[PDB]
Design an enzyme around this catalytic site. Structure first.
Site, PDB file in Angstrom:
ATOM      1  CG  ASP A 180      -1.797   1.206   1.296  1.00  6.93           C
ATOM      2  OD1 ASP A 180      -1.873   1.941   0.284  1.00  6.93           O
ATOM      3  OD2 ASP A 180      -2.406   1.439   2.367  1.00  6.93           O
ATOM      4  CB  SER A 223      -2.353  14.455 -13.319  1.00  5.41           C
ATOM      5  OG  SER A 223      -2.678  14.158 -14.664  1.00  5.41           O
TER       6      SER A 223
HETATM    7  C1  LIG Z   1      -5.789   9.627   0.876  1.00  5.36           C
HETATM    8  C2  LIG Z   1      -5.856   8.568   1.945  1.00  5.36           C
HETATM    9  C3  LIG Z   1      -6.510   8.806   3.144  1.00  5.36           C
HETATM   10  C4  LIG Z   1      -6.588   7.833   4.122  1.00  5.36           C
HETATM   11  C5  LIG Z   1      -5.997   6.601   3.919  1.00  5.36           C
HETATM   12  C6  LIG Z   1      -5.326   6.339   2.732  1.00  5.36           C
HETATM   13  C7  LIG Z   1      -4.688   5.008   2.497  1.00  5.36           C
HETATM   14  O1  LIG Z   1      -4.363   4.282   3.433  1.00  5.36           O
HETATM   15  N1  LIG Z   1      -4.530   4.645   1.223  1.00  5.36           N
HETATM   16  N2  LIG Z   1      -4.181   3.325   0.861  1.00  5.36           N
HETATM   17  C8  LIG Z   1      -5.264   7.327   1.755  1.00  5.36           C
END
Ligand SMILES: Cc1cccc(C(=O)NN)c1
EC number: 3.4.23.22
Length: 330
Positions: free
Chosen positions: A35, A199
């Protein structure tokens, strides 16, 4: 050093991808969700509340001779989809695709929310955003990539996600056989802890390119492409029968409709997401209404280049002193 691991979609829709990760001694192999939008490596474990474990593979630190309690450390994280997990922390040896880090913070879940329990295919997460987002307290911990960085041949990793097929995460090198053309690199802001970039615009199908700055994050942990409501409206306006449904929570369309491609800009370069990538199938079994893979970011507070976008590209996460992002067609 380098590492190279295959990443596999968890279901027929590419809702997420899992990558095998070796933890502890002897190795315990867990399938983790890599992630680039978070920064915690956490796992289902022997410590996880029994009723909250349903088919996942667990890490048992007591069976690892290299596992050490990180005394007094706790962690607690909440994701954009409302899910969450928390627990305590061990350090242990972690290997991905032949690349080994010793003393990696492995966050052991005592609690996970229902959505994690209900997904038997994901045994935890391996965060690849910046370590400033790591939730371990009182002493924030480094990501696997941060720990590996100085040993890598080059301070980079790459994401090559497949469409309805396996792909690859590489660490420490750029596989020049894995993409076509050139890699276009673009500036990154680390101020929010993300791989955040801008972008240069978009086009819908064979339409003309709209030059407009779209700030967003490269996030392998998010399934869909979330963009401003103006952009998303312009896309779905080109799909016969498409509508935004408040009851479903986004744009849906009849799958008898043909989806146009979506192009996004990376500097002067262009990445084309084929129409089929934007189809996430029936909203419920047997339904003729299909869920769209491009959705509004309104109310999220940030645009997210999730898997829908990234799997159309070969993506370089360049962790040099000044980080950058590279995108190539493939
Ligand atoms: C923009 C945002 C806000 C909160 C969590 C995430 C995340 O864990 N993404 N994989 C991303």
């Amino acid at each position: 050093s380098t590492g190279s691991a295959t990443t596999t979609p968890i279901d027929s829709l590419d809702d997420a991808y899992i990558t095998p990760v070796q933890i502890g001694t002897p190795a315990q192999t867990l399938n983790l969700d890599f992630d680039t939008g978070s920064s915690d490596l956490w796992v289902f474990s022997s410590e996880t509340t029994a009723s909250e474990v349903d088919g996942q593979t667990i890490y048992t630190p007591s069976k690892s001779t290299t596992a050490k309690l990180l005394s007094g450390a706790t962690w607690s994280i909440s994701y954009g989809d409302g899910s969450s997990s928390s627990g305590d922390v061990y350090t242990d040896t972690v290997s991905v695709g032949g690349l080994t880090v010793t003393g990696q913070a492995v966050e052991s879940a005592k609690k996970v929310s229902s959505s994690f329990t209900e997904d038997s295919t994901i045994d935890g997460l391996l965060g690849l955003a910046f370590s400033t987002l790591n939730t371990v307290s009182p002493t924030q911990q480094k990501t696997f990539f941060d720990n590996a960085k100085a040993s890598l041949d080059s301070p980079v990793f790459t994401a090559d996600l497949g469409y309805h097929a396996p792909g690859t995460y590489n660490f420490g090198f750029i596989d020049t056989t894995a993409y076509t053309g050139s890699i276009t690199y673009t500036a990154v802001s680390t101020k929010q802890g993300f791989w955040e970039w801008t972008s240069t615009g978009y086009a819908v199908g064979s339409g003309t390119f709209k030059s407009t700055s779209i700030d967003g994050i490269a996030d392998t942990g998010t399934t869909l492409l979330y963009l401003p409501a103006t952009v998303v409206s312009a896309y779905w306006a080109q799909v016969s029968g498409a509508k935004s449904s408040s009851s479903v929570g986004g744009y849906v369309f009849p799958c008898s409709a043909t989806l146009p491609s979506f192009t996004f800009g990376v500097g002067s370069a262009r990445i084309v997401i084929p129409g089929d990538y934007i189809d996430f199938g029936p909203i419920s079994t047997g339904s003729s209404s299909c869920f769209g893979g491009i959705q509004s970011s309104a109310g999220i507070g940030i645009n997210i280049f999730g898997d829908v976008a990234l799997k159309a590209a070969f993506v370089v996460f360049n962790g040099a002193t000044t980080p950058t992002l590279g995108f190539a067609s493939k």
